[PDB]
């Protein structure tokens, strides 16, 4: 219902969206464009990394999980710098920067 109506943005529907990708997909189907019970890409993209930074998404020591969160929200610079710090994934982060360049 609230995937069709883009409502109840605060309720993460955790009963059915238990994975991270299920959350991203749940919200990107809820973002809106031009006051209550409404979320926009700017709020969502900022809300995610500002409040729930790397710390929240890298506790499982899985780096790509956070990268996908930033890249699939149009925050390409964040995801590039972030992934560029993983000494094992420097190569990959430089190139995804070149492509964007």
């Amino acid at each position: 219902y609230c995937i069709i109506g883009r409502c109840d943005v605060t309720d993460n529907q955790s009963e059915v969206a238990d994975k991270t990708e299920d959350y991203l997909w749940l919200k990107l189907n809820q973002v809106c464009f031009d006051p209550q019970d409404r979320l926009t890409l700017s709020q969502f993209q900022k809300q995610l990394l500002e409040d729930y930074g790397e710390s929240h998404f890298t506790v499982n020591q899985q780096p790509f999980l956070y990268f996908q969160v930033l890249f699939l929200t149009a925050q390409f610079e964040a995801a590039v710098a972030f992934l560029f710090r993983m000494e094992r994934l420097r190569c990959h982060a430089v190139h995804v920067a070149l492509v964007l360049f």
């Binding site: 238990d18 994975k19 991270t20 299920d22 959350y23 998404f57 499982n60 790509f64």
Partner: peptide, 8 residues
């Protein structure tokens, strides 16, 4: 309260 469990 988003989960941190990656789709595996």
């Amino acid at each position: 309260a988003p989960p941190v469990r990656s789709i595996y």
